Amino acid sequence: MELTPDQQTLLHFIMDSYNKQRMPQEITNKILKEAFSAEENFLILTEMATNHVQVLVEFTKKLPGFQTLDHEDQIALLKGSAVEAMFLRSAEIFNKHSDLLEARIRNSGISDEYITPMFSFYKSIGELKMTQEEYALLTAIVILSPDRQYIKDREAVEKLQEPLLDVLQKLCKIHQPENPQHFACLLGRLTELRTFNHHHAEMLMSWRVHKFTPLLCEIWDV
């Protein structure tokens, strides 16, 4: 039981691209050095989200076939996946300093209504003990979701997403041959990710009192 050369090539382009992401040291130093207050904490989260959306655009452009999609559908795919991918990555980092980051998140003027499900997701992610390939493929499968709003040619997206779900399943069979439910638990994370879209919308919608960054305002229609 092994990946085909074609699947190995596909997986390789995904890992290479995923592996390039980074948080500038300029930003990380702020997590450690800036004042501790709901206002500052919220501003730091904002800066992090912005840097991530940038990292997310660079990753997506290297996804096999992404650049062959209609230009507007490329935009629609990014706007609809940004929150989901940002929560997936947050999960990853939290499950592998982090002490102070966690403290800032819990004290950034954000309701427990949001914080609670957030930290619970980090927990269920950790319990899965995901590999780097799993995190990368899940991130791409989340990006290449053919069912997002405003997509003109959904079938062209299906064509890119299907092969990723095929490789992810095979990896589960090859690496966890005795736990036939592994794939199923990864999908449970896909559906759990979708719940953060509504939550996030309410966090944005319902605290007008506040300026974000230009990049965030466009992706989230603020």
């Binding site: 940038q54 655009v57 452009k61 935009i75 990014l78 706007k79 230009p214 990049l215 466009e218 992706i219």
Partner: peptide, 13 residues
């Protein structure tokens, strides 16, 4: 003119 920054990042090199 919408998503100007997003388009700039997506369309750049």
């Amino acid at each position: 003119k919408d998503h100007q920054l997003l388009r700039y990042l997506l369309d750049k090199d």
